[PDB]
Structure formats: C-alpha cells, structure tokens
Amino acid sequence: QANLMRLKSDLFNRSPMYPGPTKDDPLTVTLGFTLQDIVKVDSSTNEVDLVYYEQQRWKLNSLMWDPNEYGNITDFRTSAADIWTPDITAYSSTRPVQVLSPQIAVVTHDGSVMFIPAQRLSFMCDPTGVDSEEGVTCAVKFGSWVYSGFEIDLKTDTDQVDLSSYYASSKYEILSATQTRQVQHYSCCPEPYIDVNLVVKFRER
Amino acid sequence: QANLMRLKSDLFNRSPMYPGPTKDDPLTVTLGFTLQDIVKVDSSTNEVDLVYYEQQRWKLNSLMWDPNEYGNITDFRTSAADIWTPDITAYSSTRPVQVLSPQIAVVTHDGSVMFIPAQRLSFMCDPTGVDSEEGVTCAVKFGSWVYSGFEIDLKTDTDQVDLSSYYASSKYEILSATQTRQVQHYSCCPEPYIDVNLVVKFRER
C-alpha cells in the first residue's frame, strides 16, 4: 500500500549511484532476441532494417531488498533512466537505433533486473540473392562498448531467436534465425572479448 | 481566481508522484481512436502511416480533491508531464510515433484523467489488394509494455470507431474500422494479456 514509494526512495536516494562493473565486481548479462520483422532491404547501400525486441537481464547486489521490510513487495517497475543499464551495442549499425517502446524495467528483490526495449536497427548487410529460393544471410554482433569479458560476461539461454511473433505478412520470409555467444582472444591480453552474433537467413515472400 | 495556482501546487508537491499500478492496486485504462487519415502505403516495405487521435482515460485516488476547499474548482488542464500516464503502446509500429498536438490533460476532482494526443504511426501492413474494390484489411494491437491484465485492465468507451472526421479527400477510402478489447491466456501462465485491436479495412479512392 505505497511502501513502494518508500522503497524506490531509499534504493535510489541514499548515496549509491552504481558506477558499473569491474574485473573485481564482474557482471553477467543474458541477451535474447525476438525478431518482429525485417522492414527494409537496401541494395544501393548495403543496409537492412530490423525490428526486434532485445531482452536484457542482469543482477546487482546494490538492488537487493528484504520484502518483509517493504509490505511484502517482491518486484517493481521503474524507468530505465533511474538505473544503471549495460552498454550493449550493435557493432555494425549504420544509423542510431530508434526506440519503439517505453523504456521501463522490472527490478526484483534478489537484485535482478530485466529490460525489453523494442528497437529499429539499420545495419551492414549485402542482400544479393534475397530474390532466390535460397535467400541470403546477414549477421550482426552485439557486445559491450567499454567492458571486457572479465567485466561484462555476455550469454544467451538459447541458440534460437524467438520467431513466434514474426509478422506473418512481411515482405521477407525467415528461413533461419540464430543468436550465439562468441569469444575472441588477443595475444596481448589475458581478458577475453565477448559478443552475441545474430545471424538471420531470409528471402522474399 | 488564483485558487488554481494553489491546487496545482498542493497536488504536484506532495510525496506521491504515482508509482504506477500493481496487482494489489490495478488500474483501468479506456482506449478509443479517431481515424483522421491513412496518409501513406508502402508496398516495397510493408508499412502504412495513420493519423489519429488517441483518447486515453483513467482514474487515480491520488488526484482527488474537494472543490469546496478550492474555490469550487471541479477540474483543471495541465501539462501531461506534470502527471503519470500509462505505457500504452502500438505493438507493431516500425518507427517512433510522432506527436502532432500539444500534450495537455484534464484532471477532475474525482481523480479522473483524460488525455487526447494526436499522432502519426507507421506500422506493419501488407497492402496487397488495396487497389481492388474489396481493398485490404490491416490491424494494430495497442497495449501496455510492462503491465499484465492484473495490473492494467484495458477497455474501450464507445463501441464504434469514430469516423466522422476522417479526411474526406484522402488517398485511401475507409471501408470499415473496428476497435475491440481482447484477452488471451498462454499455457505457461494464469494471468491474462490484454490488447485493444484496431482493425481497419481500406482501399484506394
């Protein structure tokens, strides 16, 4: 009965603003995608426009609370601005992403956060063959812009992009869509680099 | 006179900035659309552009007052940023919505709010058959981004969609338009998911 107001307060008002992870206080992000539609294919530029929902989930100690102390409150919704959010970027976009949905997140009492913004993304993609029965394949990597794998570990729960709500009358028919964790090693440096690779295969309907 | 400057201050200066609904404190949002224009059809992508007024209505205890204490004031207009508003979204958009009108609401002493923003929406729509006599049917679902049917319950006011001020000389003639509330249950989960389905059937004029 509005002890929620009390909670949002002492969580977001007493000292800490969370300064991000480190090699000493590392963090795991779970990434999944839901492909809604391939909107545009541009042959003159090599660009492709996607609408997908990017599900993102992590866990912070600094967000934990005893629900007994707060009217048996187990979770709440707050705007993503009120909180730290990881810096997961598409590595081959060609235009700033466009937010299609409200940017509200759910924080649970065990300190876990989930956050699913709908986005439109233009990225580098050669659509030659889209015309044929075989179609064409495009990939785009997502990863942190500033944090190594020792700082942000990036993982998925399934190889399979969710297609269960792909637009049934799209110009484009999906033949295959997959998300997979990749690790790169560099001989200078002991820390691994991580990305999730989104590969979609598709053709004209 | 000058009684309103006090009420506004008394409302927008007490701790309660409304934190949104909860399963314990559910909220009803009423949804109604006024079709102004189908502006654009794009057959190479599958997008359609609509101009519409979206009438939103809801009621909060936190916005009740007694007129007898406030110079017999029964209601006031205020900027929509001065208040909480629901996260009602088009689930199949393809671009950030464009706001066409000012964003001002009327609050009433019973705590009821009404808000009528004008908007341009791009959403997914296969326009095949639009040049025929039967035309083509398209649909857009609107719903909350973060709240289930146990937190935001979605409704419509007027049975019928308001076509009375649809642009008479539009490129596209409206054959029908309907707006219906809809409930679904998934196998996993007992709570309902609710949308308002705006189904419009149209043809080239």
Binding site: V106, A118, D162, S164 | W145, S148, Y186, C188, C189
Partner: peptide
C-alpha cells in the same frame, strides 16, 4: 508464446 510478448516476458522473468 508468452516470451515474444514483452509484458508477459517481464511478468515471467525466470521462465523467459
């Protein structure tokens, strides 16, 4: 299913 609808995913985090 549930998980391709954000309100549903958000309300069922462990499942989704």
């Amino acid at each position: 299913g549930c998980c391709s609808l954000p309100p549903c995913a958000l309300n069922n985090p462990k499942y989704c």
